[PDB]
Design a protein around this ligand. Sequence first.
Ligand SMILES: [Cl-]
Ligand SMILES: [Cl-]
Ligand SMILES: [Cl-]
Ligand SMILES: [Cl-]
Ligand SMILES: [Cl-]
Length: 295
Amino acid sequence: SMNPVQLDDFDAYIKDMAKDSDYKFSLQFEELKLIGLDIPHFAADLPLNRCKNRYTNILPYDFSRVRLVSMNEEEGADYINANYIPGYNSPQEYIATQGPLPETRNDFWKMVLQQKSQIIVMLTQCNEKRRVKCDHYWPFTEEPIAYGDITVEMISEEEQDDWACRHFRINYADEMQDVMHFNYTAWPDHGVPTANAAESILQFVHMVRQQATKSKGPMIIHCSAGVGRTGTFIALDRLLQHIRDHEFVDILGLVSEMRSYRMSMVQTEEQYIFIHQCVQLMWMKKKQQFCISDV
Ligand SMILES: [Cl-]
Ligand SMILES: [Cl-]
Ligand SMILES: [Cl-]
Ligand SMILES: [Cl-]
Ligand SMILES: [Cl-]
């Protein structure tokens, strides 16, 4: 479950991964399916926490789960469906979480505050094609809204074709924190995304990364399950940095590592292949960069 590939061999690699109706893609993916099967998630299974999980089979591992501050000995007080994930720069660079439910939106804001996260990435619209994905857990207007103990004011909201950016100021009594929220709204349909789809997503990943160099705390990433589009964005973000610095990539290693921190990161084979497609584009662009001589 690591397979590092030299970038000047990546073209031939993906052609081989693609032969026989993507057979080697499937085989790697079947390797990945096994990662984390015997890592405990006892907390995720507590009775009082059943209603805090969007899905019954997307549960946070106990070792990497994010804990909320607990006033109580009440069961599951500290629980949220979120895990820390390593990144390119730090071992707790990200938090991958499900899209908040109405019943957990308060818990979600508590996490943002307690974790001192200044960046939230949302890879879904609240509803898509008449299916619920995520509660609209932030305000609709500029008027501050109380979410349990934490008030959120939208300071600004900028909408583009494929994404929107929102500045939130959050407070808990005398404690105040500023948070940027980035919502990608054009996540492609099943199955082979266009060239423009891949380019749009890479542009989005680039913009979030620019804000991350200015900020501190974990970067919170969610979709609906907090595994599929979420793992994909995290993979892409790390791969962008990696490919800037190196002449090789290990995508298999990368997803294997992520699945050790949260189950089912990169949910589908189609997403796994999409990562490879995005890496082919990153490589093309780096090769364009090679035609400029500075040093
Ligand atoms: Cl950890
Ligand atoms: Cl850390
Ligand atoms: Cl403060
Ligand atoms: Cl890795
Ligand atoms: Cl996809």
